[PDB]
Amino acid sequence: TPPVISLALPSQGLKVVRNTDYTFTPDIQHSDVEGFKIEWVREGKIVSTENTYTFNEKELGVYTVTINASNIDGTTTKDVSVEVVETMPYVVKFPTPSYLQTSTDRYTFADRPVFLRPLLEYFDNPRFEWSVDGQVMEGEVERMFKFTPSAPGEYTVSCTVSEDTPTEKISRNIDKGKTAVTATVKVVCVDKKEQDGFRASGSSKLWNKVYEYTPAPGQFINETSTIGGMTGNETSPEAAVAWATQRLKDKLHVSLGSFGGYIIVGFDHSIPNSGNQYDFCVQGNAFDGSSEPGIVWVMQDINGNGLPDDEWYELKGSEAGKEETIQNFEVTYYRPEGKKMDVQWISSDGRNGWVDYLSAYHTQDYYYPAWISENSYTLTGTCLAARNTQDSQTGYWDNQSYDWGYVDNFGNDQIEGGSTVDGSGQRNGFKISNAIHADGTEANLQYIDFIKIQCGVLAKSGWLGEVSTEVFSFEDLT
Numbered sequence: 101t102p103p104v105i106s107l108a109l110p111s112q113g114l115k116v117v118r119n120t121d122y123t124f125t126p127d128i129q130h131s132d133v134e135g136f137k138i139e140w141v142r143e144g145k146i147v148s149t150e151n152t153y154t155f156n157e158k159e160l161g162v163y164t165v166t167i168n169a170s171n172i173d174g175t176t177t178k179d180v181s182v183e184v185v186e187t188m189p190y191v192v193k194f195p196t197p198s199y200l201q202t203s204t205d206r207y208t209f210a211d212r213p214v215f216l217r218p219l220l221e222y223f224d225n226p227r228f229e230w231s232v233d234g235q236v237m238e239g240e241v242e243r244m245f246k247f248t249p250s251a252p253g254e255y256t257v258s259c260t261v262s263e264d265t266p267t268e269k270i271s272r273n274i275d276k277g278k279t280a281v282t283a284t285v286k287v288v289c290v291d292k293k294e295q296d297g298f299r300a301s302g303s304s305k306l307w308n309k310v311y312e313y314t315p316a317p318g319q320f321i322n323e324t325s326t327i328g329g330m331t332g333n334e335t336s337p338e339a340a341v342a343w344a345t346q347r348l349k350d351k352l353h354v355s356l357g358s359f360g361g362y363i364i365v366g367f368d369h370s371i372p373n374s375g376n377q378y379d380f381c382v383q384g385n386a387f388d389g390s391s392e393p394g395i396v397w398v399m400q401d402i403n404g405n406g407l408p409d410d411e412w413y414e415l416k417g418s419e420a421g422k423e424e425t426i427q428n429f430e431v432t433y434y435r436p437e438g439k440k441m442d443v444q445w446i447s448s449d450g451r452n453g454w455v456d457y458l459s460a461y462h463t464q465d466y467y468y469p470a471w472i473s474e475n476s477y478t479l480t481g482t483c484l485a486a487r488n489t490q491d492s493q494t495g496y497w498d499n500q501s502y503d504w505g506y507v508d509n510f511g512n513d514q515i516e517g518g519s520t521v522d523g524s525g526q527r528n529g530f531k532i533s534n535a536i537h538a539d540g541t542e543a544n545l546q547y548i549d550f551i552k553i554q555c556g557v558l559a560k561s562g563w564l565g566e567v568s569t570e571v572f573s574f575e576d577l578t
């Protein structure tokens with residue numbers, strides 16, 4: 101009397117969700133017999149010898165799972181067809197260096213940590229497991245994993261993000277359980293030493309190239325008056341780069357729009373981490389009451405290809421580490437369904453709001469950038485706590501200052517020269533020594549090759565419109 105396997109399926113077949121645990125608990129008649137063994141076989145190999153087995157697959161398709169049970173009276177076998185047919189919006193992905201870049205590969209020098217951190221969608225209560233080259237890293241259970249290669253080569257890092265989602269009975273023998281989504285990212289430890297990537301020489305102290313101009317929505321985006329300077333031709337990322345390039349050459353404003361908007365520039369040489377007061381400066385238009393702080397991020401061309409596709413490092417400012425500052429904030433903007441409308445956003449803290457359309461001042465059809473093809477996009481960055489406030493007596497708005505560390509901000513790190521009346525010629529100076537790793541520790545960069553300015557507040561001030569960093573120039577001061 102060998103064993104027989106009972107495993108009830110839905111009458112319509114077993115149609116399951118991707119990235120979701122299904123536990124199979126078959127009834128084994130004559131499990132009492134001496135010499136009882138059970139095996140679970142998938143694509144030839146034995147995946148389990150327990151009485152239950154849990155399935156979870158990422159790819160849609162039909163998977164065959166074979167059960168084999170034995171005792172001293174004979175053997176038996178059963179085949180269950182598991183059809184992965186439904187998706188759910190749970191996503192784990194590693195970030196690229198900018199909106200328009202698609203590679204997730206990461207680059208570092210030997211003995212320099214890389215702080216790996218996935219972006220998540222739909223997760224509310226995530227748990228983390230990390231692996232390097234197939235080996236689970238015991239004790240690494242946090243949203244970031246600090247990985248430090250000690251030798252050149254390529255390393256495959258895997259992160260499984262799980263969430264305790266509600267259990268469901270699928271049949272007498274099948275239970276739907278937790279969600280678990282896996283993503284992988286390649287870390288390249290380059291063969292070079294950091295010092296050997298210093299680009300000496302150089303012909304200009306100014307920025308030499310704009311690589312990308314991806315603002316957030318704002319009243320100066322697609323603004324075609326003489327005040328805005330756009331032409332209507334900025335309908336592609338290449339045209340946006342050409343426009344920003346000419347504006348910066350002429351030291352005319354480039355607005356980043358609302359939170360997260362950014363521009364990426366480089367130089368024809370590396371800017372050293374120097375003993376001067378400042379290593380570089382950025383021209384804003386701040387005056388007292390008109391602070392629209394931009395977060396400064398810097399990048400070394402670790403992989404040597406001339407492109408800003410390596411690691412960004414934040415320059416800490418006066419608000420770094422305060423519990424009210426939000427690292428790794430995300431804002432998603434939506435192109436409105438018609439012309440002359442407010443631009444809606446939702447943020448990663450669960451808030452929602454909009455950038456106001458101001459028909460009195462900026463009369464273009466859209467404040468969402470014309471050259472962002474997609475009808476929604478998500479920008480990340482450090483978000484400072486907003487301090488724009490309206491005086492009720494006068495009704496006037498005060499976009500209040502931060503102490504130091506930010507672009508277009510009337511703080512303590514300004515370089516003499518700008519008008520305190522209208523902000524023309526205003527500059528802030530910056531120190532590469534303020535560069536930090538993602539956990540707040542010192543990055544100790546010897547030099548930088550690229551700068552990204554990221555609008556650092558999500559706010560608006562009535563008839564002033566959104567709080568939006570403007571930049572006008574970039575200069576190596578060493």
Ligand code: CNC
Binds near residue numbers: 353355392461
């Ligand atoms: C257009 C403009 C400007 N304005 Co008004 C005028 N006229 N502003 C306005 C309009 C902005 C509309 C919009 N775009 O959403 C408008 C009508 C709302 C306005 C209002 C005011 N402005 C006023 C003043 C005096 C000035 N503003 C000027 C900035 C003066 C500018 C003079 C100039 N630069 O030529 C100006 C001509 C050009 C600004 C600009 O487009 N910059 C380009 C943009 C890309 O940069 P930005 O950093 O984002 O500019 C922002 C700030 O300028 C802010 N803002 C504008 N005005 C002020 C004034 C103050 C005190 C503060 C703190 C912020 C502002 O709004 C702009 C858009 O967000 C000013 C330098 C002109 C001057 N007299 O020399 C002067 C401020 C001097 C100072 N205190 O340091 C008012 C007090 C006038 C009034 N009502 O009595 C009032 C105060 C606003 C407030 N704080 O609540």
Ligand SMILES: [Ca+2]
Binds near residue numbers: 409
């Ligand atoms: Ca590069």
Ligand SMILES: [Ca+2]
Binds near residue numbers: 392567568570
């Ligand atoms: Ca602005």
Ligand code: NA
Binds near residue numbers: 385568569570
């Ligand atoms: Na400004």
